[PDB]
């Protein structure tokens, strides 16, 4: 993970929908889960951690319990995709991902949530 990229700097999602934000990182030959770290956060609130091949939710903020998950199948393709269900107005803001795979990098992602109707 010398350089982490994001497909979008801004995501516009509808209220109540399911949101998937992504951070891409280089995977040359095949994914070694032993050395991979994936960390998602938003406004000092930890969303999810992925280390040693497992999700770590010890410091997960209570807002994202049962709502946030990491698409593990996408990790093999160099995609750290954060999936958040039942998006509410409080989910708009500034997100950040950290990927550590050999190297490490950070990327900022902005989320805007449209009004329900």
């Amino acid at each position, epitope marked *: 993970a010398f350089t982490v990229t994001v497909p979008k700097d801004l995501y516009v999602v509808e209220y109540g929908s399911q949101m998937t934000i992504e951070c891409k990182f280089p995977v040359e030959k095949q994914l070694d889960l032993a050395a991979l*770290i994936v960390y998602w956060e938003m406004e000092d609130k930890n969303i999810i951690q992925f280390v040693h091949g497992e999700e770590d939710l010890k410091v997960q903020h209570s807002s994202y319990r049962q709502r946030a998950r990491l698409l593990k199948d996408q990790l093999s393709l160099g995609n750290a995709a954060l999936q958040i269900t039942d998006v509410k107005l409080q989910d708009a803001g500034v997100y*950040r991902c950290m990927i550590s795979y050999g190297g490490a990098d950070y990327k900022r992602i902005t989320v805007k949530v449209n009004a329900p109707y």
Partner: antibody
Amino acid sequence: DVQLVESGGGLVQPGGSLRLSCTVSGIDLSSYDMTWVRQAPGKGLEYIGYISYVSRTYYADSVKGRFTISKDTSKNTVYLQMNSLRAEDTAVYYCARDRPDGAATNLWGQGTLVTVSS
Amino acid sequence: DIQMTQSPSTLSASVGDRVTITCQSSQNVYSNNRLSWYQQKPGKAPKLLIYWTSFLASGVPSRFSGSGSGTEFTLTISSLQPDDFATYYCAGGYSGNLYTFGQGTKLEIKR
């Protein structure tokens, strides 16, 4: 490539004020935290404070009420404004990418020397 | 309020030896794993060796190894090389965006 450069160190009288600058190259200041660390002559590393990627600031207890950290993204610079300097503040001052426990704190500046003395 | 103690304060070894540095924290590090190790040589800025208790930074030789959880942590250097003689610092991250450094361990050349 990525570069860190401190500047602004020099001689200050006790009770004086001094502002240090950390000019970055190849670091997205909207995506990276930046930390200030000092080292007194012959002593160990001491965390001072850091400013997050969303411009929130945190300080060690030893500089609370005296040091303030700010960021100017349009100038690629992170600042350390030091007030009410004491002789104990004499140290080399480093700015480091990321936080002291961060995965990307492998890049440090060369440090700038601050001397507080009468 | 938060203190981190390194032991031993000084190490003496030869090239090819194995040494261990112990880092003890009064408070649990954040998520029980936010402990980093640094290497510093005189006149130079610190160098990041390990983060998240066991993850080597880019270019760090595999002979460096970290372990521990909570409040007790260990850095192990197997088969010392001449480049390894330096001063070593652990650093902890804590809830509420708090940080501290250990007092440092000096690894000198035994003769």
